[PDB]
Amino acid sequence: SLCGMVWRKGTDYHKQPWQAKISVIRPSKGHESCMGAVVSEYFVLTAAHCFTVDDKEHSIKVSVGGEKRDLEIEVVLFHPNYNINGKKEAGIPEFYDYDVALIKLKNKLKYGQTIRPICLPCTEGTTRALRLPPTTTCQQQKEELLPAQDIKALFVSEEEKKLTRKEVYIKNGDKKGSCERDAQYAPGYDKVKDISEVVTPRFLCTGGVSPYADPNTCRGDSGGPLIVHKRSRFIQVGVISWGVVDVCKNQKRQKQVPAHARDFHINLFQVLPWLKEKLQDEDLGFL
Numbered sequence: 001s002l003c004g005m006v007w008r009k010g011t012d013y014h015k016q017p018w019q020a021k022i023s024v025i026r027p028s029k030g031h032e033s034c035m036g037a038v039v040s041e042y043f044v045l046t047a048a049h050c051f052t053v054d055d056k057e058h059s060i061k062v063s064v065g066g067e068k069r070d071l072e073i074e075v076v077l078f079h080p081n082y083n084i085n086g087k088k089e090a091g092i093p094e095f096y097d098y099d100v101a102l103i104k105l106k107n108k109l110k111y112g113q114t115i116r117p118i119c120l121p122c123t124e125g126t127t128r129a130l131r132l133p134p135t136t137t138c139q140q141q142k143e144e145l146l147p148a149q150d151i152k153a154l155f156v157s158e159e160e161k162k163l164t165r166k167e168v169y170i171k172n173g174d175k176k177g178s179c180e181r182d183a184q185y186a187p188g189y190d191k192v193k194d195i196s197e198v199v200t201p202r203f204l205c206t207g208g209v210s211p212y213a214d215p216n217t218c219r220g221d222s223g224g225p226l227i228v229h230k231r232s233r234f235i236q237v238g239v240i241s242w243g244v245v246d247v248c249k250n251q252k253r254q255k256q257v258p259a260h261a262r263d264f265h266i267n268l269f270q271v272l273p274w275l276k277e278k279l280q281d282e283d284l285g286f287l
């Protein structure tokens, strides 16, 4: 398939046709909505923390293309290393390591103007999307997409079928350490002796006011794709996992600590063995 390409100047799901909207069937505070990405005709990639651990398949509804209709969910695949309770002993009340999950749909999606797959790292789709030679390796795709730099990226927020594109910078050069250490401003992580325990090698970091004023995520953006845009093609590099400031509830707090208001995303280059295995029959051509 031709991944990560728009399919006229339309709006919302015409501009971001890989976006998926997730709703928690029995909602509570902190457990209302999530986002996801269409990655193949049968699969939506999201965050594991969006589901109940028991009876995952009946814990959410998912929609694509801004449709009212919910898609039938056949199976939910959690990354095997995901465990929100895994570091309670270290004073880490919620641990978001490996916070990725795949929704297998019962019915094949039909791609159209409002439903299209986004490109995934270390696939032939991404080689073609980036107009790269057939000798391209996974490591070369990583150098092209995640150089040791502040990386221009974007994520999308949803409200009543309206999508808002937000430009952010991934701190992957000399700001990476500072970005990660700002996990300590997250309520509930402020007393962890060693903050590297909360921010593992699975994470990319955005947010703050340098080099630009990055918008922050809200809980409801959880599971949405963190995207790199090159020459009219969109490549997913991350899954939105967790934030330091919920700017949907707490714009007071971002204004108090704007230099440290970070967002954390699961790096898809760090879960490739799991992606490649679960998606091996989806014709994506993993390297």
Ligand SMILES: CCO[C@H]1CCN(Cc2c(OC)cc(C)c3[nH]ccc23)[C@H](c2ccc(C(=O)O)cc2)C1
Pocket: 049, 093, 094, 186, 187, 188, 189, 217, 218, 219, 220, 221, 222, 240, 241, 242, 243, 244, 245, 246, 247, 249, 250, 253
């Ligand atoms: C136990 C450790 O919890 C940490 C990490 C999770 N966050 C909530 C959270 C997500 O949770 C999965 C997911 C996304 C995408 C989020 N985007 C922004 C916040 C946020 C917590 C929190 C709670 C309240 C406020 C506030 O009042 O500002 C800010 C952060 C701190």
